[PDB]
Amino acid sequence: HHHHDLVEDSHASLELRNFYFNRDFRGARDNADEWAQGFLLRLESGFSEGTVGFGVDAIGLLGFKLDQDDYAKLGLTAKARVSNSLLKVGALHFKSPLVSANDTRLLPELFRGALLDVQEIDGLTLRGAHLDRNKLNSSSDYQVFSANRIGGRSDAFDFAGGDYRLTPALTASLHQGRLKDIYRQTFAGLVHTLDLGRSLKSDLRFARASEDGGFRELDNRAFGALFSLRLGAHAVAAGYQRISGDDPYPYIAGSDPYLVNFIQIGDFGNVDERSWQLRYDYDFGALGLPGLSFMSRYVSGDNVARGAANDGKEWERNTDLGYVVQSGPLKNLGVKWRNATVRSNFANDLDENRLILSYSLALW
Protein backbone atom coordinates (compact mmCIF):
# COMPACT_ATOMS: atom_id res chain seq x y z
CA HIS A 1 0.00 0.00 0.00
CA HIS A 2 1.34 3.37 -1.11
CA HIS A 3 1.22 5.65 1.97
CA HIS A 4 2.89 2.98 4.00
CA ASP A 5 5.57 2.36 1.38
CA LEU A 6 6.33 6.07 1.80
CA VAL A 7 6.99 5.55 5.51
CA GLU A 8 8.42 2.03 5.50
CA ASP A 9 11.29 3.07 3.21
CA SER A 10 11.69 6.57 4.61
CA HIS A 11 14.75 8.00 6.34
CA ALA A 12 15.33 11.01 8.53
CA SER A 13 18.08 12.94 10.30
CA LEU A 14 18.54 15.97 12.51
CA GLU A 15 21.51 18.28 12.23
CA LEU A 16 22.57 20.84 14.84
CA ARG A 17 24.71 23.83 13.93
CA ASN A 18 26.20 26.36 16.25
CA PHE A 19 27.74 29.14 14.22
CA TYR A 20 29.92 32.14 15.02
CA PHE A 21 30.84 34.57 12.30
CA ASN A 22 33.11 37.63 12.41
CA ARG A 23 33.88 40.33 9.82
CA ASP A 24 36.56 42.91 10.69
CA PHE A 25 37.18 45.76 8.21
CA ARG A 26 40.37 47.75 7.76
CA GLY A 27 36.23 51.35 7.65
CA ALA A 28 35.55 49.44 10.89
CA ARG A 29 32.08 51.02 10.50
CA ASP A 30 30.98 47.91 8.60
CA ASN A 31 32.11 45.34 11.20
CA ALA A 32 29.63 42.48 11.64
CA ASP A 33 29.44 39.80 14.31
CA GLU A 34 26.93 36.98 14.73
CA TRP A 35 26.41 33.98 16.98
CA ALA A 36 23.56 31.64 16.01
CA GLN A 37 22.08 28.18 16.50
CA GLY A 38 20.47 26.13 13.74
CA PHE A 39 18.45 22.93 13.42
CA LEU A 40 17.92 21.09 10.15
CA LEU A 41 15.44 18.21 9.92
CA ARG A 42 15.72 16.24 6.69
CA LEU A 43 12.92 13.82 5.77
CA GLU A 44 13.10 11.54 2.75
CA SER A 45 10.18 9.16 2.08
CA GLY A 46 10.19 5.98 0.05
CA PHE A 47 8.30 5.64 -3.23
CA SER A 48 4.84 4.23 -3.97
CA GLU A 49 4.86 0.96 -5.98
CA GLY A 50 4.65 0.94 -9.75
CA THR A 51 6.25 2.11 -12.99
CA VAL A 52 6.26 5.63 -11.64
CA GLY A 53 6.97 5.79 -7.92
CA PHE A 54 5.89 8.87 -6.01
CA GLY A 55 7.26 10.28 -2.77
CA VAL A 56 7.73 13.39 -0.69
CA ASP A 57 10.73 14.96 1.01
CA ALA A 58 10.68 17.70 3.60
CA ILE A 59 13.28 19.95 5.12
CA GLY A 60 12.72 21.87 8.33
CA LEU A 61 14.85 24.87 9.19
CA LEU A 62 14.96 26.63 12.51
CA GLY A 63 17.50 29.29 13.37
CA PHE A 64 17.95 31.84 16.13
CA LYS A 65 20.57 34.43 17.02
CA LEU A 66 22.40 34.12 20.34
CA ASP A 67 24.50 37.34 20.34
CA GLN A 68 19.03 37.81 9.72
CA ASP A 69 19.06 34.07 10.63
CA ASP A 70 16.06 34.32 12.99
CA TYR A 71 13.43 32.08 11.37
CA ALA A 72 11.68 28.77 10.88
CA LYS A 73 10.74 27.20 7.59
CA LEU A 74 9.45 23.96 6.23
CA GLY A 75 9.86 23.22 2.54
CA LEU A 76 8.07 20.36 0.87
CA THR A 77 9.26 18.54 -2.23
CA ALA A 78 7.15 16.15 -4.27
CA LYS A 79 9.14 13.59 -6.24
CA ALA A 80 8.58 11.09 -9.03
CA ARG A 81 10.76 8.20 -10.06
CA VAL A 82 11.09 6.03 -13.17
CA SER A 83 13.85 3.47 -13.42
CA ASN A 84 16.70 5.39 -11.77
CA SER A 85 15.73 8.85 -13.01
CA LEU A 86 14.27 11.43 -10.62
CA LEU A 87 12.01 14.46 -10.84
CA LYS A 88 11.65 16.82 -7.89
CA VAL A 89 9.22 19.72 -7.52
CA GLY A 90 9.10 22.14 -4.61
CA ALA A 91 12.07 23.05 -2.42
CA LEU A 92 15.41 22.29 -4.09
CA HIS A 93 19.07 22.34 -3.14
CA PHE A 94 21.63 21.05 -5.61
CA LYS A 95 24.90 21.74 -7.41
CA SER A 96 25.50 22.29 -11.14
CA PRO A 97 27.82 24.42 -13.31
CA LEU A 98 25.20 27.09 -14.00
CA VAL A 99 23.45 27.21 -10.61
CA SER A 100 24.51 25.91 -7.16
CA ALA A 101 22.72 26.48 -3.87
CA ASN A 102 24.91 27.77 -1.08
CA ASP A 103 25.28 26.13 2.31
CA THR A 104 28.25 27.87 3.95
CA ARG A 105 26.33 29.81 6.58
CA LEU A 106 23.87 28.67 9.31
CA LEU A 107 21.01 27.43 7.15
CA PRO A 108 21.08 26.55 3.41
CA GLU A 109 19.87 28.57 0.46
CA LEU A 110 16.85 26.94 -1.17
CA PHE A 111 15.34 27.26 -4.60
CA ARG A 112 11.75 26.63 -5.57
CA GLY A 113 11.01 24.87 -8.85
CA ALA A 114 11.43 21.58 -10.69
CA LEU A 115 14.66 19.63 -11.03
CA LEU A 116 15.04 16.58 -13.29
CA ASP A 117 17.95 14.13 -13.04
CA VAL A 118 18.08 11.50 -15.77
CA GLN A 119 19.97 8.40 -14.66
CA GLU A 120 23.28 7.74 -16.44
CA ILE A 121 22.45 6.06 -19.75
CA ASP A 122 25.49 5.13 -21.81
CA GLY A 123 27.91 7.23 -19.82
CA LEU A 124 25.63 10.25 -20.24
CA THR A 125 23.82 12.07 -17.45
CA LEU A 126 21.24 14.71 -18.33
CA ARG A 127 19.90 17.27 -15.89
CA GLY A 128 17.49 20.15 -16.16
CA ALA A 129 15.67 22.63 -13.96
CA HIS A 130 13.07 25.36 -13.96
CA LEU A 131 13.46 27.57 -10.90
CA ASP A 132 11.28 30.54 -10.01
CA ARG A 133 12.26 31.57 -6.49
CA ASN A 134 15.39 32.09 -4.42
CA LYS A 135 15.43 31.82 -0.66
CA LEU A 136 18.66 33.34 0.60
CA ASN A 137 20.53 31.25 3.18
CA SER A 138 19.86 33.82 5.94
CA SER A 139 16.13 34.38 5.27
CA SER A 140 12.83 32.50 5.40
CA ASP A 141 11.10 33.89 2.34
CA TYR A 142 11.35 33.12 -1.37
CA GLN A 143 12.13 36.06 -3.62
CA VAL A 144 12.70 36.61 -7.33
CA PHE A 145 16.25 36.39 -8.67
CA SER A 146 18.84 38.98 -9.57
CA ALA A 147 22.42 38.53 -10.78
CA ASN A 148 25.59 38.98 -8.73
CA ARG A 149 27.05 42.50 -9.26
CA ILE A 150 24.89 42.94 -12.37
CA GLY A 151 21.47 43.38 -10.76
CA GLY A 152 18.26 42.96 -12.72
CA ARG A 153 15.08 41.14 -11.72
CA SER A 154 13.96 37.74 -12.89
CA ASP A 155 11.39 35.17 -11.91
CA ALA A 156 12.68 32.29 -13.98
CA PHE A 157 15.91 30.39 -14.27
CA ASP A 158 16.10 27.50 -16.73
CA PHE A 159 18.94 25.17 -17.65
CA ALA A 160 19.64 21.84 -19.29
CA GLY A 161 22.97 20.05 -19.35
CA GLY A 162 24.72 16.79 -20.05
CA ASP A 163 27.72 15.14 -18.42
CA TYR A 164 29.33 12.55 -20.70
CA ARG A 165 32.07 10.08 -19.84
CA LEU A 166 34.18 9.86 -23.01
CA THR A 167 36.19 7.24 -21.17
CA PRO A 168 36.31 6.10 -17.55
CA ALA A 169 38.81 8.86 -16.78
CA LEU A 170 37.54 11.72 -18.93
CA THR A 171 34.24 13.56 -18.57
CA ALA A 172 32.91 16.27 -20.89
CA SER A 173 30.11 18.62 -19.90
CA LEU A 174 27.89 21.11 -21.66
CA HIS A 175 25.23 23.17 -19.88
CA GLN A 176 23.05 25.95 -21.22
CA GLY A 177 20.74 28.14 -19.19
CA ARG A 178 18.98 31.44 -18.88
CA LEU A 179 18.19 33.87 -16.09
CA LYS A 180 15.15 35.24 -17.85
CA ASP A 181 15.34 38.94 -18.73
CA ILE A 182 18.86 39.22 -17.37
CA TYR A 183 21.39 36.89 -19.00
CA ARG A 184 22.05 33.75 -21.00
CA GLN A 185 25.01 31.53 -20.21
CA THR A 186 26.57 28.41 -21.65
CA PHE A 187 29.19 26.25 -19.98
CA ALA A 188 31.61 23.65 -21.34
CA GLY A 189 33.86 21.57 -19.12
CA LEU A 190 36.41 18.83 -19.39
CA VAL A 191 37.60 16.81 -16.41
CA HIS A 192 40.34 14.20 -16.46
CA THR A 193 41.02 11.96 -13.47
CA LEU A 194 44.34 10.14 -13.48
CA ASP A 195 44.52 7.46 -10.75
CA LEU A 196 47.96 5.90 -10.31
CA GLY A 197 49.71 4.19 -7.39
CA ARG A 198 48.23 9.14 -5.71
CA SER A 199 46.38 11.06 -8.46
CA LEU A 200 46.08 14.06 -10.80
CA LYS A 201 42.77 15.74 -11.56
CA SER A 202 42.60 18.24 -14.41
CA ASP A 203 39.55 20.51 -14.48
CA LEU A 204 39.03 22.89 -17.42
CA ARG A 205 36.12 25.34 -17.58
CA PHE A 206 34.81 27.80 -20.15
CA ALA A 207 31.59 29.80 -19.85
CA ARG A 208 30.19 32.58 -21.97
CA ALA A 209 27.28 34.86 -21.10
CA SER A 210 25.27 37.55 -22.91
CA GLU A 211 22.10 39.52 -22.09
CA ASP A 212 18.58 38.11 -22.30
CA GLY A 213 15.33 39.86 -23.21
CA GLY A 214 15.46 43.62 -22.81
CA PHE A 215 18.32 43.66 -20.32
CA ARG A 216 21.21 46.05 -21.03
CA GLU A 217 23.88 44.54 -23.27
CA LEU A 218 26.10 42.09 -21.49
CA ASP A 219 29.27 40.30 -22.51
CA ASN A 220 31.31 37.95 -20.33
CA ARG A 221 33.69 35.04 -20.67
CA ALA A 222 35.33 32.97 -17.96
CA PHE A 223 38.03 30.38 -18.38
CA GLY A 224 39.25 28.23 -15.52
CA ALA A 225 41.89 25.55 -15.08
CA LEU A 226 42.39 23.59 -11.84
CA PHE A 227 44.98 20.88 -11.36
CA SER A 228 44.75 18.89 -8.13
CA LEU A 229 47.58 16.56 -7.19
CA ARG A 230 46.91 13.95 -4.51
CA LEU A 231 50.05 12.46 -2.94
CA GLY A 232 49.25 10.22 -0.02
CA ALA A 233 48.04 12.31 2.89
CA HIS A 234 49.13 15.46 1.03
CA ALA A 235 47.22 17.39 -1.65
CA VAL A 236 48.34 20.38 -3.70
CA ALA A 237 46.26 22.23 -6.29
CA ALA A 238 47.12 25.03 -8.71
CA GLY A 239 44.41 27.06 -10.35
CA TYR A 240 44.24 29.62 -13.12
CA GLN A 241 41.27 31.86 -13.93
CA ARG A 242 40.65 34.65 -16.45
CA ILE A 243 37.49 36.69 -16.78
CA SER A 244 36.93 38.61 -20.07
CA GLY A 245 34.58 41.03 -21.80
CA ASP A 246 32.84 44.15 -20.51
CA ASP A 247 31.06 42.36 -17.68
CA PRO A 248 31.98 40.32 -14.58
CA TYR A 249 31.04 36.62 -14.15
CA PRO A 250 27.23 36.45 -13.93
CA TYR A 251 25.31 34.11 -11.61
CA ILE A 252 22.27 34.13 -9.34
CA ALA A 253 22.88 36.47 -6.42
CA GLY A 254 23.07 34.57 -3.13
CA SER A 255 24.24 31.36 -4.85
CA ASP A 256 27.67 29.84 -5.62
CA PRO A 257 29.52 30.56 -8.91
CA TYR A 258 31.26 27.61 -10.60
CA LEU A 259 34.61 29.40 -10.83
CA VAL A 260 37.78 27.45 -10.03
CA ASN A 261 39.13 30.35 -7.91
CA PHE A 262 35.90 30.93 -5.98
CA ILE A 263 36.94 30.64 -2.34
CA GLN A 264 35.82 31.66 1.18
CA ILE A 265 34.95 35.27 0.34
CA GLY A 266 35.78 36.22 -3.25
CA ASP A 267 34.88 34.72 -6.62
CA PHE A 268 37.69 36.47 -8.51
CA GLY A 269 35.10 37.06 -11.19
CA ASN A 270 35.58 40.83 -11.54
CA VAL A 271 35.75 42.52 -14.93
CA ASP A 272 38.96 41.46 -16.71
CA GLU A 273 40.26 39.69 -13.59
CA ARG A 274 43.12 37.24 -13.95
CA SER A 275 43.97 35.08 -10.96
CA TRP A 276 46.05 32.14 -9.82
CA GLN A 277 45.59 29.90 -6.82
CA LEU A 278 47.80 27.62 -4.82
CA ARG A 279 46.16 25.26 -2.37
CA TYR A 280 47.40 22.70 0.15
CA ASP A 281 45.51 20.00 2.12
CA TYR A 282 46.70 17.51 4.70
CA ASP A 283 44.70 14.53 6.00
CA PHE A 284 45.99 13.58 9.45
CA GLY A 285 44.57 10.05 9.34
CA ALA A 286 47.75 8.28 8.24
CA LEU A 287 49.56 10.16 11.02
CA GLY A 288 47.15 8.71 13.56
CA LEU A 289 44.72 11.60 13.99
CA PRO A 290 41.65 10.62 11.96
CA GLY A 291 39.17 13.46 11.96
CA LEU A 292 41.76 16.25 11.97
CA SER A 293 42.00 18.26 8.75
CA PHE A 294 43.91 21.29 7.53
CA MET A 295 43.57 23.33 4.38
CA SER A 296 45.40 26.46 3.30
CA ARG A 297 45.02 28.44 0.11
CA TYR A 298 46.05 31.67 -1.54
CA VAL A 299 44.73 33.48 -4.59
CA SER A 300 46.15 36.53 -6.29
CA GLY A 301 44.25 38.52 -8.90
CA ASP A 302 45.20 41.42 -11.18
CA ASN A 303 44.17 43.09 -14.44
CA VAL A 304 40.91 44.15 -12.77
CA ALA A 305 39.05 46.98 -14.51
CA ARG A 306 38.93 50.33 -12.71
CA GLY A 307 37.25 52.68 -15.12
CA ALA A 308 39.41 52.70 -18.24
CA ALA A 309 42.31 51.21 -16.32
CA ASN A 310 43.21 47.57 -15.63
CA ASP A 311 45.44 48.04 -12.61
CA GLY A 312 43.05 46.57 -10.04
CA LYS A 313 44.46 43.83 -7.85
CA GLU A 314 43.51 41.71 -4.90
CA TRP A 315 44.57 38.70 -2.96
CA GLU A 316 42.93 36.41 -0.41
CA ARG A 317 44.30 33.90 2.06
CA ASN A 318 42.09 31.13 3.52
CA THR A 319 42.89 28.62 6.25
CA ASP A 320 40.57 25.79 7.38
CA LEU A 321 41.29 23.89 10.59
CA GLY A 322 38.82 21.17 11.53
CA TYR A 323 38.25 18.25 13.87
CA VAL A 324 35.61 15.52 13.91
CA VAL A 325 35.23 13.48 17.12
CA GLN A 326 35.82 9.85 16.17
CA SER A 327 34.47 7.96 19.20
CA GLY A 328 32.75 8.04 22.58
CA PRO A 329 29.48 9.86 23.32
CA LEU A 330 30.21 12.96 21.24
CA LYS A 331 31.11 10.93 18.15
CA ASN A 332 30.39 12.73 14.84
CA LEU A 333 30.54 16.11 16.58
CA GLY A 334 32.61 18.35 14.27
CA VAL A 335 34.29 21.71 14.80
CA LYS A 336 35.62 23.79 11.93
CA TRP A 337 37.50 27.10 11.91
CA ARG A 338 37.62 29.02 8.62
CA ASN A 339 39.84 32.13 8.56
CA ALA A 340 40.09 34.45 5.57
CA THR A 341 42.07 37.60 4.79
CA VAL A 342 41.41 39.80 1.77
CA ARG A 343 43.35 42.85 0.46
CA SER A 344 42.57 44.89 -2.67
CA ASN A 345 42.93 48.31 -4.29
CA PHE A 346 39.31 48.41 -5.49
CA ALA A 347 37.39 46.97 -2.51
CA ASN A 348 37.69 47.11 1.25
CA ASP A 349 40.22 44.98 3.10
CA LEU A 350 38.63 42.35 5.30
CA ASP A 351 39.45 39.69 7.84
CA GLU A 352 36.82 37.01 8.42
CA ASN A 353 36.53 34.16 10.91
CA ARG A 354 33.91 31.45 10.81
CA LEU A 355 33.56 28.90 13.59
CA ILE A 356 31.05 26.09 13.05
CA LEU A 357 30.18 23.37 15.56
CA SER A 358 28.03 20.70 13.93
CA TYR A 359 26.35 17.47 14.99
CA SER A 360 24.34 15.09 12.78
CA LEU A 361 22.05 12.37 14.13
CA ALA A 362 20.28 9.70 12.09
CA LEU A 363 16.70 9.31 13.30
CA TRP A 364 15.87 6.30 11.09
Ligand SMILES: CCCCCCCCOCCOCCOCCOCCO
Ligand atom coordinates in the same frame (compact mmCIF):
# COMPACT_ATOMS: atom_id res chain seq x y z
C1 LIG B 1 49.64 21.88 9.41
C2 LIG B 1 50.88 22.62 8.91
C3 LIG B 1 50.88 22.78 7.39
C4 LIG B 1 52.22 23.27 6.85
C5 LIG B 1 52.56 22.59 5.52
C6 LIG B 1 53.88 21.82 5.60
C7 LIG B 1 54.33 21.25 4.26
C8 LIG B 1 54.41 19.72 4.35
O1 LIG B 1 55.32 19.20 3.40
C9 LIG B 1 55.95 18.00 3.83
C10 LIG B 1 56.26 17.14 2.60
O2 LIG B 1 57.44 16.40 2.79
C11 LIG B 1 57.53 15.24 1.98
C12 LIG B 1 58.32 14.14 2.71
O3 LIG B 1 59.63 14.00 2.17
C13 LIG B 1 59.90 12.70 1.67
C14 LIG B 1 60.93 11.94 2.50
O4 LIG B 1 60.32 11.22 3.56
C15 LIG B 1 59.04 10.71 3.24
C16 LIG B 1 58.76 9.39 3.97
O5 LIG B 1 58.15 9.61 5.24
